[model samples]
Target: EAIGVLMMCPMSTYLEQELDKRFKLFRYWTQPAQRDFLALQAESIRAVVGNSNAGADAELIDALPKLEIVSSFSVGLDKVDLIKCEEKGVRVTNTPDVLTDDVADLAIGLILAVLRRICECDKYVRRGAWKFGDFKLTTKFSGKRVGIIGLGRIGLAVAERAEAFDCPISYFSRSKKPNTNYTYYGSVVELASNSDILVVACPLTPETTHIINREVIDALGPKGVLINIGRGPHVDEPELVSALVEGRLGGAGLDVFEREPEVPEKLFGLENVVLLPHVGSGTVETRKVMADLVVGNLEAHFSGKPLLTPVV
Candidate 1:
């Protein structure tokens, strides 16, 4: 019998093509009736493919009884329910380490775009505003204190890049990391208070949800800048918007928003805020490697070989 692989949504066209050729592929989103289709194909689907956003929820997992493994295209497993997967003996694999450099590079890109007003300068040129007057001076990123949350793979990668430009790196994690001499702060507000550039690089969980709240935003103050390459839920949407609108907090460079693809309309007008479409691991080279990893993990799972990157 052929291996049955169920893809949640349109992630990468290349990934879909690879799965289609190798297995009995099922496109979950194409169905008008998801529950009925799952019921119909429950016995056939043994593996699942998901993206960072499209994950195998507990409800969806329960519906697919024969499901053995979940192979995700992206590095972050924020949407994947690890607890439920582990409890059910379902293996979970994500494309980790491969996309870390791309995400970290983009985090630096956000910082530069906001601090140096890179996008604003581009707009000034396009609108012919520069013909009327000189572009306003922007803040410098070098030698600025960078306070990071999480201090994991992506966070540490950001720190290394920041350090090359003489940034003093500090972090706030669950506990102190003995590896490096980066300054450690016990709380999020404390980290925000001390740093010039505050970044949210942590995971999304009950404890970490809204990690950047009103108090933290206030601590960052009007001169400080916030950069988020992590999940959008890491920051309190209402609080961030209110602070940015009122000028109580400084600028923000956000790649991810609480409601992705639907950014808050109020932020569109703010010159201090730079918004992105959540394309951290969106480079062509990285995405191609990520697609291969997704296919490789699925192939490994069905062949009884060790997974390239297993989350559960």
Candidate 2:
């Protein structure tokens, strides 16, 4: 029962090993003749594993007649075509709760880094700028008003942590939750206007793309800080850069960019911004657990059992 499994991209070495043990794994990116390879093994490849950067779309789904499942390594399915998968009768699953705490912790870390100028402080000490004069005083983290976009799992996790630091929490979502005491705004602009720090934690959909536009940025004003742990396209990158450069907005902490690994050069020289290479769920413990979920979902699907975290 060695089902052929195609991997869209490299995730974890541990996950690679685990999949190798159970299936005949095909590394899609490693193939020189990818089209030829897929054609040859079209009937053999029954499962596909992917992450945020790469996932099955309508084109890819149509290519594999034997494809039965797509198990994702990430919680966000922006890259995957759910409608196409459902139409093709292909099951879909993703690792969710296992990575929530790590992502939320990173969100809090970004908020602190931007406000307290933690990265700037580290550079100041390393470059001996501290010797010339004490580093300039920075903003405090406690008791700031935090506005969250999308009160989903990650959003709630971020809110809980921000609350512990005495930050007042407010949110904007498709629908307001009736159970929570947290204030809800009818629009994102309203949320930005009342917040000291604006955070993006929403899933990426056509309606949510460019959710943080110039109007919202300006509403947050020059004293506000932006923290984005969500997908990069959620904010208009050009608008954000212009706002930061023009001093219309304060500081920012970014984990994702409009284009992966390509950040705006203007932000590089700025001390108010902290940039990370999308490591929200990159912690060793959490990554291993997420990998386990991906593998478990794939295993369950092949054995005719239920998926661990099915999206379709």
Best by lDDT: 2
TM-score of each prediction: 0.97, 0.98
RMSD of each: 1.1, 1.1
Report every candidate's CA lDDT: 0.91, 0.93
Q: lDDT for model 2, on a 0 to 1 scale?
A: 0.93
RMSD of 1: 1.1
User: On a 0 to 100 scale, what is the lDDT of residue 66 in model 1?
Assistant: 92
TM-score of candidate 1 relative to the true fold: 0.97
> Which pairs of residues clash in candidate 2, taking residues 3 or more apart in a chain or in different chains?
none
